């Protein structure tokens, strides 16, 4: 589930050749989710 609806905030995963829309509601805006990857920084 790599995407989040921008109105009902429900996790949803989109396959290829698939509608770019939410399933629980009909919102066309999908926010991409943040996964677990290393992001090095400096405590400066």
């Amino acid at each position: 589930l790599k995407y989040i609806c921008a109105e009902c905030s429900s996790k949803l995963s989109l396959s290829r050749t698939d509608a770019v829309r939410c399933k629980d509601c009909g919102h066309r805006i999908l926010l991409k989710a943040r996964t677990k990857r290393l992001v090095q920084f400096e405590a400066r």
């Binding site: 989040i4 921008a6 009902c8 905030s9 429900s10 926010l31």
Partner: protein, 69 residues
């Protein structure tokens, strides 16, 4: 936004005093000067950090994209 952990001018850690400052203002009828004095902030450089903090993160937190609203 969120309470600064260290005072800018000197470096005294004032980040652990915001919640206690709010408690001293709320529970007791202490004014800001007396509350800052009781918290251990002597120099006005330290006093301003907690006296003038705005704490905008509370207003920032109501726009949560990961929760059904």
């Amino acid at each position: 936004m969120i309470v600064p952990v260290r005072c800018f001018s000197c470096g005294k850690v004032v980040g652990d005093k915001w919640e206690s400052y709010l408690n001293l203002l709320q529970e007791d009828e202490l004014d800001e000067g007396t509350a800052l004095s009781r918290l251990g902030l002597k120099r006005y450089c330290c006093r301003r950090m907690i006296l003038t903090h705005v704490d905008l993160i509370e207003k920032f937190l109501r726009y949560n994209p990961l929760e059904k609203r």
